[PDB]
Design a protein around this motif. Structure first.
Motif, mmCIF file in Angstrom:
data_model
loop_
_atom_site.group_PDB
_atom_site.id
_atom_site.type_symbol
_atom_site.label_atom_id
_atom_site.label_comp_id
_atom_site.label_asym_id
_atom_site.label_seq_id
_atom_site.Cartn_x
_atom_site.Cartn_y
_atom_site.Cartn_z
ATOM 1 N N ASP A 1 5.958 -7.980 -7.379
ATOM 2 C CA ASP A 1 5.194 -7.199 -6.412
ATOM 3 C C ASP A 1 5.562 -5.717 -6.479
ATOM 4 O O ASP A 1 6.661 -5.342 -6.889
ATOM 5 C CB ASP A 1 5.436 -7.754 -5.008
ATOM 6 N N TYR A 2 4.621 -4.863 -6.071
ATOM 7 C CA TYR A 2 4.792 -3.417 -6.157
ATOM 8 C C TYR A 2 5.407 -2.783 -4.910
ATOM 9 O O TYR A 2 5.676 -1.576 -4.917
ATOM 10 C CB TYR A 2 3.447 -2.743 -6.479
ATOM 11 N N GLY A 3 5.629 -3.547 -3.842
ATOM 12 C CA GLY A 3 6.266 -2.983 -2.659
ATOM 13 C C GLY A 3 5.435 -1.973 -1.890
ATOM 14 O O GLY A 3 5.994 -1.156 -1.152
ATOM 15 N N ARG A 4 4.109 -2.023 -2.016
ATOM 16 C CA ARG A 4 3.221 -1.036 -1.416
ATOM 17 C C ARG A 4 2.599 -1.494 -0.104
ATOM 18 O O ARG A 4 1.905 -0.702 0.539
ATOM 19 C CB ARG A 4 2.104 -0.686 -2.398
ATOM 20 N N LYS A 5 2.812 -2.742 0.303
ATOM 21 C CA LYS A 5 2.204 -3.248 1.532
ATOM 22 C C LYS A 5 3.173 -3.208 2.716
ATOM 23 O O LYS A 5 2.816 -3.549 3.845
ATOM 24 C CB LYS A 5 1.646 -4.663 1.323
HETATM 25 K K K Z 1 2.592 -4.588 -2.704
#
Ligand code: K
Ligand code: K
Ligand code: K
Ligand code: MG
Ligand code: MG
Length: 136
Positions: free
Chosen positions: A132-136
RNA sequence: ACAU
DNA sequence: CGATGT
């Protein structure tokens, strides 16, 4: 049930949906990034999730690896199983690149074989997938 | 409803 | 809050 730690995890990242799309694959056990796709100017979340799985299949096949792939995307897992990405995104000049890549991924699925299990990452039980990109 |  | 999908 139990996580299969000997596996590849993939995920999309985006700026907007539709918007700029990228994806990456990581070693589930260690978090090591194994591949990353250069950002694509316009795409959807589901197109990117689909491309990520197909790239994983190609990556593992080239390396003679029988590891499974984890994805958090019910949609993309189904599209790969069907060998058809049923995206609603308009096909126009702005979306030509993502559609080219999706078309090429379908073409690869239709001309190659693989035994790689494609497994659902159970986010509700295990937290965010390790790619996951950690953007949420 | 569920999955992003 | 908006979007993409089954
Ligand atoms: K994310
Ligand atoms: K998620
Ligand atoms: K919906
Ligand atoms: Mg995801
Ligand atoms: Mg994610």
């Amino acid at each position: 049930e139990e996580i299969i730690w000997e596996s590849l995890s993939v995920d999309v990242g985006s700026q907007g949906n539709p918007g700029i799309v990228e994806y990456k694959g990581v070693d589930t056990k260690t978090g090591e990034v194994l591949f990353e796709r250069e950002p694509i100017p316009i795409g959807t979340n589901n197109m990117g999730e689909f491309l990520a799985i197909v790239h994983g299949l190609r990556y593992l096949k080239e390396r003679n690896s029988r590891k499974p792939i984890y994805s958090d995307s019910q949609t993309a897992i189904k599209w790969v199983k069907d060998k058809k990405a049923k995206s609603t995104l308009v096909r126009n000049e702005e979306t030509a690149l993502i559609w080219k890549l999706v078309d090429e991924a379908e073409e690869w699925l239709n001309t190659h074989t693989y035994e790689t299990p494609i497994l659902k990452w159970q986010t509700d039980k295990w937290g965010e997938i390790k790619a996951d990109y950690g953007r949420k």
